[PDB]
């Protein structure tokens, strides 16, 4: 599939089109799109929730949900919480490459 780049308008198909779709999904909220209230992620609503073992069960679900809905060309490998520094939660998201 051939799409356009977000900045600079360039037609890129494989590498950055798969990256500009996933990295947008993690920070786009629900209801921000016009007439599409189910596109986006609950990750903007996961801010200031307490970091528990049931919280990681939700983020690993919402990564698997919001990318499983609207990005079928990405196979998710692992969403591991690797560091809690100063309230900042480091979640490693290693994704496979297709095409």
């Amino acid at each position: 599939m051939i799409g356009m780049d977000r900045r600079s308008g360039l037609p890129l198909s494989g590498l950055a089109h798969l990256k500009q779709s996933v990295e947008d999904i993690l920070t786009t909220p629900l209801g921000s799109r016009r007439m599409r209230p189910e596109y986006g992620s609950k990750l903007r609503r996961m801010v200031d929730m307490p970091v528990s073992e049931g919280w990681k069960s939700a983020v690993q679900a919402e990564v698997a949900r919001s990318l499983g809905r609207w990005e079928p060309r990405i196979g998710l490998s692992a969403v591991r919480v690797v560091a809690v520094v100063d309230g900042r939660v480091d979640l490693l998201l290693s994704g496979v490459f297709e095409g």
């Binding site: 209801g31 016009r34 007439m35 209230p37």
Partner: protein, 55 residues
């Protein structure tokens, strides 16, 4: 079923919480509202939208 907006509320966000879907539910809201479309899409603090029944 008239509801009052806020100063940053938008039409398709409001009637998705009320109705549950947006197929044929936004332009029917603009149809059965006098002068709603004339008003700017980011609604003012105290406009009144009358949401019709049976979308």
């Amino acid at each position: 079923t008239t509801c009052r907006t806020a100063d940053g509320d938008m039409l398709d966000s409001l009637c998705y919480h009320v109705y549950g879907h947006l197929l044929g539910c936004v332009e029917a809201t603009l149809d059965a509202n006098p002068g709603l479309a004339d008003e700017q899409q980011p609604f003012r603090a105290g406009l009144l939208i009358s949401f019709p029944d049976m979308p």
